[PDB]
Symmetry: C3
Subunit: 307 residues, 3 copies
């Protein structure tokens, strides 16, 4: 009888059933900090090309969208594209053996053009299907072995989170320093390399193909006057698949007119997209809850006494 | 007495009250696949114009923002706009009868310019209020009868969802094939026409004015060791109003300098915006929950025996 | 005994425990309305400059991302930037006393360039560290005293919210008029000045540095056939910090080629970002819930009779 009561009180205190539970409504704002300089040479379209320059903050990041920001880590540039007819890039399914090899008015899913039914020569007696689209088509090329945005990990991000709860009627807002698991857990500025070290994923390896990382924030807050604890817990987990179109990459174009001719530049962007997740639990003691718990435990105690 | 107990156990098993319930934290990544070629001629500004060309993946879509992507289906192009003074486009409230007809320093909500108080001639003794803004103003014109992006329905979208739960400490990640309601429900690649066929909304009709469609995912997962079921359920529903500024459309500009003169191109974009929604329910059996349910049913059984 | 029963029924009716509770899944679409004309003169780079013109809808706003839109209120323009070497802008940590004062191959966090280790003269015997990046670097300059987008408050925004619930199997969709707290609470068109008047924050003061505002919507809906109440409640709260890199601002660039030379224009954007939040509570009466509540109150009544 007494043991059932002590265990009921201990379980109720451990689960905190007397305090009312409610979700948290958060609004996040992020500011990217740090710049990187790319000075690597990679051949393009059969010709060796040298790339050099520095990327400002606005060059490698977008504004926060849906409580999540993106950061570039690698890219493939294609300049001078203009609508027209050209032979498709050589692929396992793009090479044509004869003129009538390909089908007219057909567009493959992987191909970025609609075939006109003509077998043309891309380079030196190598025939692919004549396609109608942005010419020339971007070459199928793996991400560069060294991630162009090598200095991306040394970057530091600033995350400001505003918490609001309807029942509480309060809003909680979350020196230059880098967040550390134990030394400095309060610093809201994070080093990407520190995050990937938290998740155990190589930043240099992921930056080549791209990735999707998210920052999880847990709130174990209780509105009780006695034990008032409300501190943001920072947990990190990788959303990308790892094993592996893996990583994060999309086609982004910039259109310009040259010599009275419409032109477009297609850029394949590989990067890491961070999703800021805010999950919290609020608990403001309510008399009805305590009365319900007591009412439920009373029967258990009585049955324990009956045996 | 016995019937009340059997009904209590049957109801508890049907509602699954013994298993702990928790929400699901998801992160979605989408990749658009497919291209369309537009070769339609539509008159513009009183002159017949011919439009032809193919649109790549980067041309008709944006990067995923807020777990939702947008896909263009129709557009109205306006080129050569530059700041200055010009007569407003003829409308029910823009035509001026006399010079002093319009008010100086006034800007109507529907109008995109601030009137200077001068009644000018747009074309052939037709007078509208002189306005200061991007000139010339884009003409009020209905969406083209045939949706320019006819081939949009044949497109295929790839959706990858990563599920994470705090109490479970696990992450679940969700061949070229098209998803089917019964034949192939596992294929994560979707044909837009298949979605609109699921919702029963004509794609060709909606593409003209634009629309907002969302993909709902339901999770009826249970963490119990006995019955372990965790499969993503795909439900589809149209968020747009249908009846009807209906549809989805926004003004998107691209600024270029020509002949040492600042210029801007205004494009009215009509398209369908897909919102990926992830709703799930987790249930990991907890002793406290079962004890609470039993404690609540005990009183009901006793009262049933008392009668 | 009787008082405990009457109080139990009154408390159950007040808390509405018999009705099933469920969250709400919303999809929001926003359309910005109104235009502003900027005709202010502010000196730039030691030279007085005059700015004049009108901004269309597409100029000061982006498409809705993550159920939240952004509206510009102030900006700093920097034109002609091109990659190269140049002296950094004079700052407390950028001025070099001697040639060997600065460290080679070092980039400060606040600085947007990587120092080459050379002490150069920015203007008249004033030495800063030679940096490699976008040249010339944007000058450190406070936001203009008068917010360039003065007419932003007079703007009107249209918000359309679609509500969906899985258990209810229904979708609820939410004349030109401005929403008022009491006169016209149904008008879905909002005047920004009206919002900031609701939150008590000066719009003219915030527009200079920028801000983050959110529109909260509460749903106290009950699916009971007797008392069927389901009306959207509009509550407003400011997410920005106020006290204070405060406000909302980001670097946004536009790249153009001039005289066969790659060039970029960096624009520091200050604005207010509105986050549309949808929180609701659904309640469809369930027999199991009522039976549970009654079972929990029965023990309390019996104990009250025992005394
Ligand atoms: C990130 O910062 C670290 C220093 O905190 C850099 O490490 C140095 O790298 C240089 C070569 O660039 C070496 O000469 C130094 O010996 C390194 N020092 C340390 C302590 O590691 C690192 O190179 C930076 N990474 C990037 C991509 O810029
Ligand atoms: C989408 O694909 C279907 C085929 O799966 C196309 O249907 C064909 O259309 C052509 C005309 O372009 C007809 O000659 C064929 O007879 C059609 N076949 C079938 C099976 O429908 C359809 O035209 C495509 N739609 C778009 C907009 O490209
Ligand atoms: C917003 O609209 C109000 C009117 O509703 C404007 O107020 C007028 O401002 C002009 C000067 O531009 C004065 O001559 C009038 O006397 C004002 N009238 C009233 C009733 O206030 C206000 O200027 C507008 N604000 C902006 C930034 O355009
Ligand atoms: C804003 C844009 N950044 C861009 N940065 C470059 C600046 C100079 C030269 C470049 N060359 C190749 C590639 C990039 C650049 N260029 C564009 N557009 C971007 C960033 C992240 C993801 C997509 C797009
Ligand atoms: C990225 C952009 N796509 C664009 N595609 C075109 C490419 C060539 C010619 C065009 N002509 C008219 C209209 C479009 C185009 N042009 C721009 N900007 C876009 C896509 C979807 C929604 C808004 C904006
Ligand atoms: C789309 C863009 N608006 C822009 N509007 C201008 C139009 C003409 C002259 C300008 N001069 C200075 C500054 C702006 C402008 N220009 C660009 N890019 C924008 C809007 C809001 C936030 C970021 C970016």
């Amino acid at each position: 009888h007494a043991l059932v009561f002590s265990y009921i009180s201990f379980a109720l205190i451990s689960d905190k059933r007397y305090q009312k539970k409610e979700p948290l409504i958060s609004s996040v704002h992020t500011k990217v900090k740090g710049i990187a300089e790319v000075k690597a040479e990679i051949l393009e379209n059969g010709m060796k090309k040298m790339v050099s320059g520095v990327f400002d903050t606005a060059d490698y990041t977008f504004p926060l969208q849906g409580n999540s920001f993106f950061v570039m880590t690698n890219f493939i540039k294609t300049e001078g594209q203009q609508q027209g007819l050209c032979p498709d890039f050589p692929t396992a399914r793009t090479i044509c053996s004869s003129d009538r090899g390909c089908k007219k008015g057909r567009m493959d899913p992987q191909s970025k053009g609609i075939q006109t039914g003509r077998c043309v020569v891309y380079k030196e007696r190598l025939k692919t299907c004549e396609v109608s689209a942005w010419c020339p088509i971007e070459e199928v090329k793996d991400a560069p072995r060294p991630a162009l945005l090598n200095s991306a990990e040394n970057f530091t991000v600033l995350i400001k989170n505003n918490i609001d709860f309807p029942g509480h009627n309060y809003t909680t807002r979350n020196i230059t320093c880098t967040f550390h698991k134990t030394q400095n857990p309060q610093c809201p500025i994070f080093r990407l390399g520190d995050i990937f070290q938290e998740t155990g994923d190589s930043f240099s390896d992921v930056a080549i193909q791209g990735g999707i990382m998210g920052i999880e924030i847990y709130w174990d807050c209780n509105l009780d006057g006695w034990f008032h604890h409300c501190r943001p817990k920072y947990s990190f987990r990788r959303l990308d698949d790892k094993t592996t179109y893996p990583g994060y990459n999309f086609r982004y174009a910039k259109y310009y007119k040259e010599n009275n001719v419409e032109k477009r530049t297609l850029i394949k962007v590989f990067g890491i997209r961070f999703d800021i997740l805010v999950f919290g639990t609020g608990g403001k003691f309510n008399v009805i809850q305590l009365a319900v718990y007591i009412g439920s435990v009373i029967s258990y105690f009585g049955l324990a006494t009956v045996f």
